[PDB]
Amino acid sequence: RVVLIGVAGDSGCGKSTFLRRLADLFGEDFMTVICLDDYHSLDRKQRKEMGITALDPRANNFDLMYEQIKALKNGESIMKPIYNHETGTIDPPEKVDPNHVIVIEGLHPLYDERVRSLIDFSVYLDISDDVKIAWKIKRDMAERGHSYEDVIASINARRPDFMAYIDPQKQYADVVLQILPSQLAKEEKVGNILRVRMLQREGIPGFEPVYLFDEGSTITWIPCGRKLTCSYPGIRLSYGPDEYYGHPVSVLEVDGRFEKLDELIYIESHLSNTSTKHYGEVTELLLKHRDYPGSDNGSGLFQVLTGLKMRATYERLTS
Amino acid sequence: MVRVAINGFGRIGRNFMRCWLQRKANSKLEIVGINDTSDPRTNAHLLKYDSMLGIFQDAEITADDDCIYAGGHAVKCVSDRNPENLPWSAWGIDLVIEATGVFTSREGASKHLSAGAKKVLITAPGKGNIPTYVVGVNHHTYDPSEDIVSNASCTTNCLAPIVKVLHEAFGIQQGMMTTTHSYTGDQRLLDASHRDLRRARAAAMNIVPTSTGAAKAVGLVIPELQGKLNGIALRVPTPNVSVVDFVAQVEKPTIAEQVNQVIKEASETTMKGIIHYSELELVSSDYRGHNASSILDASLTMVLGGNLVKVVAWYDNEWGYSQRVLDLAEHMAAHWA
Amino acid sequence: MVRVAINGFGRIGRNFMRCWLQRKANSKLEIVGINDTSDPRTNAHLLKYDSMLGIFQDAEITADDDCIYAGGHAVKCVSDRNPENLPWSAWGIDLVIEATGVFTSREGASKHLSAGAKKVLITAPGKGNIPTYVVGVNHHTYDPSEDIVSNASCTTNCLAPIVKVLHEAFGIQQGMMTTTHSYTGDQRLLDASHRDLRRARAAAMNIVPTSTGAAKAVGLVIPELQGKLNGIALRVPTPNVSVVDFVAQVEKPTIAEQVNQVIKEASETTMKGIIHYSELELVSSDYRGHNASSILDASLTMVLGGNLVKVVAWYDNEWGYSQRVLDLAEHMAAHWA
Amino acid sequence: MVRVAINGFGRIGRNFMRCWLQRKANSKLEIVGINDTSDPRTNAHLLKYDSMLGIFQDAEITADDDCIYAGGHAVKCVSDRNPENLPWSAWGIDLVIEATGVFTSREGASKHLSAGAKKVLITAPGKGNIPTYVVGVNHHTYDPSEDIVSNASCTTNCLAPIVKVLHEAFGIQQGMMTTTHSYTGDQRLLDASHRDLRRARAAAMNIVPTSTGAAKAVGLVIPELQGKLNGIALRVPTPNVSVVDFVAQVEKPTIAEQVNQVIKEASETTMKGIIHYSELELVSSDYRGHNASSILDASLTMVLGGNLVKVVAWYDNEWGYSQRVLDLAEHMAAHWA
Amino acid sequence: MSNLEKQIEQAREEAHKICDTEGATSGQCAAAWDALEELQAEAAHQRAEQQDHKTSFQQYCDDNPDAAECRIYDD
Ligand SMILES: NC(=O)c1ccc[n+]([C@@H]2O[C@H](COP(=O)([O-])OP(=O)(O)OC[C@H]3O[C@@H](n4cnc5c(N)ncnc54)[C@H](O)[C@@H]3O)[C@@H](O)[C@H]2O)c1
Numbered sequence A: 001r002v003v004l005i006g007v008a009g010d011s012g013c014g015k016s017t018f019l020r021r022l023a024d025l026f027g028e029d030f031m032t033v034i035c036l037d038d039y040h041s042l043d044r045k046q047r048k049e050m051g052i053t054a055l056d057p058r059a060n061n062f063d064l065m066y067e068q069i070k071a072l073k074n075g076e077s078i079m080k081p082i083y084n085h086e087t088g089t090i091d092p093p094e095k096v097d098p099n100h101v102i103v104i105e106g107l108h109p110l111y112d113e114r115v116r117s118l119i120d121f122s123v124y125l126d127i128s129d130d131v132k133i134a135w136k137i138k139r140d141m142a143e144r145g146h147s148y149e150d151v152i153a154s155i156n157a158r159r160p161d162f163m164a165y166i167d168p169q170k171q172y173a174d175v176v177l178q179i180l181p182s183q184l185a186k187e188e189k190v191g192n193i194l195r196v197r198m199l200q201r202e203g204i205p206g207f208e209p210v211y212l213f214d215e216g217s218t219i220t221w222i223p224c225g226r227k228l229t230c231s232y233p234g235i236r237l238s239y240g241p242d243e244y245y246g247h248p249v250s251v252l253e254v255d256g257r258f259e260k261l262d263e264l265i266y267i268e269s270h271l272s273n274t275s276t277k278h279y280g281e282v283t284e285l286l287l288k289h290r291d292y293p294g295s296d297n298g299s300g301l302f303q304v305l306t307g308l309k310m311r312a313t314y315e316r317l318t319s
Numbered sequence B, C, D: 001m002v003r004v005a006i007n008g009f010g011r012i013g014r015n016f017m018r019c020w021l022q023r024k025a026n027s028k029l030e031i032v033g034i035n036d037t038s039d040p041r042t043n044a045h046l047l048k049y050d051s052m053l054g055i056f057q058d059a060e061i062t063a064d065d066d067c068i069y070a071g072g073h074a075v076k077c078v079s080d081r082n083p084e085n086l087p088w089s090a091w092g093i094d095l096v097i098e099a100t101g102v103f104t105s106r107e108g109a110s111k112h113l114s115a116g117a118k119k120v121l122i123t124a125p126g127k128g129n130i131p132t133y134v135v136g137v138n139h140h141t142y143d144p145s146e147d148i149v150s151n152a153s154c155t156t157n158c159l160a161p162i163v164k165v166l167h168e169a170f171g172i173q174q175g176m177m178t179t180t181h182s183y184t185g186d187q188r189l190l191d192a193s194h195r196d197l198r199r200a201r202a203a204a205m206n207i208v209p210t211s212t213g214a215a216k217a218v219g220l221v222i223p224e225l226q227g228k229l230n231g232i233a234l235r236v237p238t239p240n241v242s243v244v245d246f247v248a249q250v251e252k253p254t255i256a257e258q259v260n261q262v263i264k265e266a267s268e269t270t271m272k273g274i275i276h277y278s279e280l281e282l283v284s285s286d287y288r289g290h291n292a293s294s295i296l297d298a299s300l301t302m303v304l305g306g307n308l309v310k311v312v313a314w315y316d317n318e319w320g321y322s323q324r325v326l327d328l329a330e331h332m333a334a335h336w337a
Numbered sequence E: 001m002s003n004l005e006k007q008i009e010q011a012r013e014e015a016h017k018i019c020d021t022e023g024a025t026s027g028q029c030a031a032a033w034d035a036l037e038e039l040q041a042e043a044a045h046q047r048a049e050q051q052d053h054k055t056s057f058q059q060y061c062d063d064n065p066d067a068a069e070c071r072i073y074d075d
C-alpha cells in the first residue's frame, strides 16, 4: 500500500524539526521526503522577468506533480525534477522509488484539489508574525550578516499575496498548529516561550481528537500544585471546542516552558486518545533528542502528538 | 573505644585493615587482633603490597614474629584454625570480624562467643536464621543484644539499596538479577578437584556460571519481597570489580528517564554514600576503589512496556564491601550495649 | 555447483573457510574467491594456524602470491578496499559473503551486485530494510529474487530460536536479554582512540558494557514481537565463547521444569542441529567448536511467579555463527533461481 | 619557558601529559599542542580515566571541540594525519614530541621541522643515523644543534644503565638479553591480519616471541659495545609492566654479591633516579608507576664460572619511559640553543 | 560562501532600488523581496550545514571505516 502525508508551511522544505521528529518516530527507511520547491515552473531569472514570487499558482507545474503523485500509488519509481537552489535553475530529474510512507511538503501541498482528494492526512503549520520576527532576528544575528530591520519591511511585503495564496489551504487541512507569543511571560525577548495551539478537526474517521479531560467543553488547566513544584512561569494548558471557518474543531493549547521531567510526564498522563501502545511514549519521544529546538516548550509536544496521530492513521490504513 | 579483631586475614581482612588505616581518626574502633593461617611475617608483606590496590603509601608496615607495626600502631597476631583456643578474653575483644568463609553457621560463629568474645560480625550470608543487616537499608533496626550479626554477600550488599529505592518509589511484583561477578578465591586456578563442579574449572579462562541465593537475601533484609527475588551469577576473568544486572517487574508504570531521576535524587537525599550516580560512559576498571556500594550506570537503564525495568550497577566486591563492613562495625560501636 | 566468494578474510571468513573444508562433500558451494587487506602469503598462515581452533589437520594449506592451495583445491585471492574494482564477473561469482563489517548498508553491499556479483549474503545486522534470515526460524520464507540477504548478529542468531520456541509454546508479552559476550576485534587492546567510548577501553582488563539493537532483530525475524525485545551486552575478557541471559514475561503460567521439557523436545523434533540441550554442569570453554547455535543450560532455568522465565544459552559466536552462515548459503544454493 | 607539542596522543602521549601534570612547577616546558586521530572530546576522557593508572585526581579535566582544559590550564588540540598541514609556526612550537610510531625515519620526522617546528624528540628507535640519547647514560653528550633527537625503545632505556654500570666496573666481552615484555598496542587482539606473523596472533592468549634490534641500540648509546649485544623479546599477557633478563659475559671475574654491591652503590651515587635497587621479593604489579627506569631485582642475580653474569630488571614501559622522555625534554630545554 | 555572499548584498541593493522606485506595494518588488528571502534561506541552509561540520570521525570513517578507530561490531 501507499500512504500519504501532507505538511504545509514556509519553514523551508526539509528545514523544520517536525520532519526530524517524524524521522525519529518512523525512520527514513520507512519514509521518504519530497520537497515541493522542485516543481517550480521557471527560475528566479524568470521570476524577476515575470515579476512574480515563488508562491504563484502559475509558478508550478501542478499537473506533472499530480501525475507523479498518482503514479506513486501504483508502485512505480517516480522521476522527479530538482530545483537547483543556489542557481535558481532546474536539475534534470532523479529517479526515486516509493516507500511505505510518502510525505509531501511545501508551500502548495494542498492547493490542488485532486491531490487534496489524494492526501491521506494533512498538516498545516502556522506561525505568527511576531515569532517570525524573533526567528529572523536569530537568523541574521547568529549569521551576523547585518541585514536586519528592513527584513521587517520584507515581512509585510511578503504578507498580502501569502494570505491569498497559502492561508486558504488551512480551511482544508486536518491539523493546524499556531504558534503565538506567550501571554504568560512578559519580561523576556519576544521569542523565548511560545503559546502554541493545535487546532485539530473532527469529522474524517480514524483521526480522533486528543481531549483534555472532556470532549467538548473548554477547560484551562494549570498542573501546578500538590504534586508539582512549578518554576517560573510554569505551564498553563487549555482546551476548547470551537468552530473554525465553520468546521468542527477542538483546540488543544499549551503555554509555558518545560523545565524538567516530572512536569512533562504528569501532563502526558492526563491527555486522552493520544494513541500510544506504550506508557509515557510521548515523553520518551520528547527526550530522545534534548538538543532539538523547541523541545522545552509545547511545540515539541504538539509536533510529536501530530506525528503520533500519523502513526494512528498509518495503522488504520495498513490494518 | 572498642577493641576489635579480625578472623581470617584474606581479601576482606586486608581490605578491612586498609580501610581502617584510611579512616583512623573518626573511628571508635581499634584493631587489636588478627589471625590467619600464615605467619606474621608474610601477611604484613601482603598487606603492604597488594597487587590490586597497589603499594600502600600513607603509613609504614613492618612486622616481627609476634606483632605487626602498622604506622607505629601495634597490632597483635596469632595463628590457629581452632576458634576455641584463641586468646579473646586475654586480649579484651568486644567485636570479632568473621571473614574466613568457614564459620557461616550460628554454631560455628558462636565458638568465638564461647571462647571469650562479646560480639561477632560475620561477612558472609550465614546459614540459619542469623540476623542480617545492610548499611543503607536496615542498619538501624538491629537490636544491640544481637551479638551474632551478619552482613550479606557483596552482591546483595550492592543490589538491596537499588531494590529498596525501586520498591518504595514504584512497588515491585517480581524481580530477577544476573550479576557478572569477578572471580573470587574459591575457584581453582587450573582445572582442579573441587566440591562444586562449575567452580572446579579454570578461572582465568572461563565464564563459569553459578547459582546463588544471595538474591534471596534481599528478601531477608526487605521482608515484604521474600520469595520474589532470585538470580544467578556469572564469574568472568576480571580480578577486581563486578557489575550486576537487575530486572524488576514493577506495577506502577513509568519510563526509563524517571527511574534514573528517582535514583539520582535518592543518591542525594537518603542513599548518600551508598549509591553513587554516574552519567559517564565508564568501564569496569574505573571503579577500582570507589567508595559507594553501588554505582548506577545511567545510560543502560531501560523500561519495556511500562512495567518492566532493567538497571545495571557497578560495584567493587573487595573495597566497597569492606567499606560497608567497617561502616556497620562503627555503627554497632556507636550503639554499644 | 555454486561459485561463491568471501569479502574480508577475518574471523568469520577464516571460520567459514574452515567449515567448508570440513563440510566439503555435501556442498553445492565451491569457494573460489577471497579478498583481504593482507597479501596471500599471510592469510594462508592465519588459516592454518588459528590460535583458537588449533592447527588445522585434515588438509594441507599452502600459498603463493596469487592463489591459495587448500588440500590441493585451488582458490583465487586478491586485495582491494574498493568493492567496485573487483573481478567478480571475471570469476563467475553467484554469491559473495560480505564479512568485513563495513558494508552494512544496502548501498554499500549493492556495490558488489553492481560490480558483477549475483547475490550477496552479509553477515551483519544491516542498516536499512535488508531482508534478514536466521537458520532454524525463518530460513524458508526468503524469496529467491532477494539477492541481498542478511544474517543477523551472533547474539540474535543464538537468541531467536529460544524465543521462537517460547513464543509458540507459551506466548510472550515482553522480554529482556543480557548477553555476556566474548570480546570481539572491534575493541582496542590498550586504551586507544575509538569512535565509541566504551569500546575505547582495554579489552583484556575490563567488563565493558555496550548497548545493542541485536535483541530487536528478533522482532524482525519474528514479526509479532517487534518493539517488545530489548537488551544490552557485556564484553568480558574471554576470547571465544559467550553466554546470553534471557528474561521473558510469558502469559501462560508454568514452572521451571516444563520449559526445560519443551525446549528438550524441541531440540529433538524441530530445532535439531540448531538447539542442543545439556543437563551437564559444563563451563564456557567446553563449547569451543560446538555445532549448535544455542546450547541451553538446563540447571539455571528459573520461573518466578509463574509468568516470568529466565533461560541462559551458551553459544560460540565464532564457530556456530559461521555454521549458520554456511547453512544459509547452502540453503540458498538449494533454492537458486 | 619552552612551548612543546605532542604528536599522537596514545599511551606514551597520555603518560607524558600525566607526568607533566604531576611535574608542573619545576618545568620549563608548557604543553600547548596535541594532535590525535580522535576528536578532542574523546581523548580528554581517555586522559582522565586511564584503565591502567586509575582515575586522575589532582586536576580537573574537561574539553570542548577546540581546546582541552586540564586543571584550568588550556591546551590546543587538532586532528590531522598529514604532518605538513599542521599549525606549528602558528602556535610557536619549539619542540614536538613524536609519539605515533609512524615517523621513525629522518625524512618522516623532518616533516615537522619543515612545517614550522624547531626541534623534534621522537620516542622510538628511529631508522637511519638519528642521534639517540638515554637519560642516565649519555644525556649530556648531545649537541644542541641536533634538532632531531631520538629516545630509544623502553627496553633499551631500561637495559642501557645496567650495561653502563657493568661495563665500567667489570668490562663486557659479549652480552645477551631476553626481555619478557608486556603486550603493546601493535598486536592484534584476536587473530587478525598483520604485517608480521608473530604479532598477528592473539595477545591475551599467547606468549608471542619477537625479534628486536633494541638490544643493539645499547651499542649506539655505548659506542664500544656495538655489534656485541643482541637479544629477543617475549610478549606475555600482562598489560603494563615488564622484566628484562640480561646475560653478560664479563672478563674481570667476580661473584653474585659483588655485582649487587656495585649496582647498589651506583644507585646511590650516579644512577640516582635512574636505577632503583630492591632487596624485596616483589612481583610485577608492584612496579606500576615506579619512577625509576630500572629496578634491579636483587635475589635473582647470579654468576657462573666467575665470568658470566645474569641480572634481571623490572621496568615499566609505559610510565618510566614517559618519565625519561620528559626528563630528556627538560634537559634539552635547559640547554636550549 | 563567496558567490551567494555577494549575491545577497546585490539583491539587497535591488531591494532598496526597485521597491523605492517602481512601486512600493505591487508584485514586482514583492517578487524582489521574495527572491532576497530565498537567498537568505539558502544562506540559512548553508549555515546549518556548516554548523554540522564534523571534525574527524565522519571523515576518516566516511572514507576508511574498517580502521581500528571506528570498527563497530554492533553485536
Ligand atoms: N572475595 C570477595 O570479594 C568477597 C566479597 C564479599 C564477601 N566475601 C566473603 O568473604 C569471605 C572471605 O573472602 P576472602 O576473599 O578474604 O577469602 P580468602 O580465601 O581469599 O581469604 C580467607 C583467609 O582466611 C584464612 N582462613 C580460612 N579458614 C581459616 C580458619 N579456620 N582459621 C584461620 N584462618 C582461616 C584463609 O587461609 C585466608 O587467609 C568469604 O565468606 C567470602 O564469600 C568475599
Ligand SMILES: NC(=O)c1ccc[n+]([C@@H]2O[C@H](COP(=O)([O-])OP(=O)(O)OC[C@H]3O[C@@H](n4cnc5c(N)ncnc54)[C@H](O)[C@@H]3O)[C@@H](O)[C@H]2O)c1
Pocket (backbone or CB within 6 Å): C007, C008, C009, C010, C011, C012, C013, C035, C036, C037, C080, C081, C082, C099, C100, C101, C102, C123, C124, C153, C154, C184, C185, C186, C317, C318, C321, D190, D192, D193, E066, E071, E072, E073, E074, E075
Ligand atoms: N567477531 C565475531 O565473533 C562475530 C560474530 C558474529 C558476527 N560478526 C560480524 O562479522 C564481521 C567481521 O567479523 P570479524 O571478527 O571477522 O572482523 P575482523 O575485523 O576480525 O576481520 C575483518 C577482516 O576484513 C578486513 N576488511 C575490512 N574492511 C575491508 C575492506 N573494505 N576490504 C577488504 N577487507 C576488508 C579486515 O582488515 C579483516 O581482515 C563484523 O560485521 C562482525 O560484527 C562477528
Ligand SMILES: NC(=O)c1ccc[n+]([C@@H]2O[C@H](COP(=O)([O-])OP(=O)(O)OC[C@H]3O[C@@H](n4cnc5c(N)ncnc54)[C@H](O)[C@@H]3O)[C@@H](O)[C@H]2O)c1
Pocket (backbone or CB within 6 Å): C190, C192, C193, D007, D008, D009, D010, D011, D012, D013, D035, D036, D037, D080, D081, D082, D099, D100, D101, D102, D123, D124, D153, D154, D184, D185, D186, D317, D318, D321
Ligand atoms: N607501548 C609502550 O609501552 C611503548 C614503550 C616505549 C615506546 N613506545 C613507542 O611509542 C610509540 C607509540 O606508542 P603508543 O602505545 O602510544 O601507541 P598507540 O598506537 O597506542 O597510540 C598512538 C596514537 O597515535 C595515533 N596516531 C598514529 N599515527 C598518527 C598520525 N599519523 N597522526 C596522528 N596521530 C597518529 C594513533 O591513532 C594513537 O592515537 C611507538 O613508537 C611505540 O613503539 C611504546
